[PDB]
């Protein structure tokens, strides 16, 4: 979780030095740590070693890789997992779909990203808050001001109070098109924000109010 790959490697070596065969869950944590540090080579070694010791990967293991690949935009490796999930008897859950959108987005495949969101709704499922944030980053990245607006107000149309990440993406799409009117409109929303403290501080510090020694 914290991305301490060095400590994770020492745990695995300590277990092996004591003739202890680590569990399938224990390796998945090691695979998680390497993906946090973008060490794909060492992550796939641990994935390979799981089959060697008989600790076959679980569904969570195929998610540690997908999120690790999603951050780097390695949709070629993401499709390998997806093509492996179908024949492994694992149906595509919502978490798998989020990583696919995130991987395609970071890889620059905007058309294939929205298609996954288009094909996701056909297969029913239930998009969560991150899925809306996953598809919002796609439209924000490809400078879609009107599409982002329709994505944003629907986030609050269900009384969800979108997180600070979605707010920062709105400032990007407005700042990319130099729409200084909408930037000031959204900043005032973050300035009051009586419910959430993180928006207020981050919104205030964007304008430069908190750029002092004591105010930092």
């Amino acid at each position: 979780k914290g991305g301490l790959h060095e400590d994770a490697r020492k745990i695995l070596q300590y277990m092996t030095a004591k003739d202890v065969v680590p569990s399938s869950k224990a390796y998945t944590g090691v695979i998680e740590a390497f993906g946090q540090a973008a060490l794909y080579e060492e992550a796939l070694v641990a994935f390979n070693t799981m089959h060697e010791v008989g600790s076959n990967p679980s569904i969570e293991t195929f998610h540690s890789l997908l999120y690790s690949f999603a951050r780097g935009g390695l949709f070629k490796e993401s499709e390998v997992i997806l093509s492996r999930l179908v024949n492994s008897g694992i149906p595509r859950n919502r978490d798998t779909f989020n990583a696919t959108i995130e991987a395609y987005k970071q890889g620059g495949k905007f058309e294939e990203a929205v298609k996954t969101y288009v094909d996701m709704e056909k297969s029913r499922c239930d998009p969560d808050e991150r899925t809306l944030e996953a598809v919002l980053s796609v439209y924000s990245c490809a400078r879609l001001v009107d599409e982002c607006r329709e994505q944003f107000e629907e986030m609050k149309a269900s009384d969800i109070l979108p997180s600070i990440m979605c707010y920062c993406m709105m400032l990007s799409v407005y700042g990319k098109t130099e729409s200084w009117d909408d930037v000031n409109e959204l900043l005032e929303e973050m300035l009051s924000n009586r419910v959430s403290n993180i928006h207020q501080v981050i919104g205030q510090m964007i304008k430069g109010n908190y750029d002092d020694d004591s105010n930092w």
């Binding site: 796939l44 994935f47 390979n48 070693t49 089959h51 060697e52 490796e77 390998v80």
Partner: peptide
């Protein structure tokens, strides 16, 4: 006569591709 003189590494370690 005929009785004389007593008569897996490299597996699960492939390229992910």
């Amino acid at each position: 006569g005929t009785g004389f003189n007593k008569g897996d590494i490299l597996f699960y370690h492939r390229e992910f591709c």
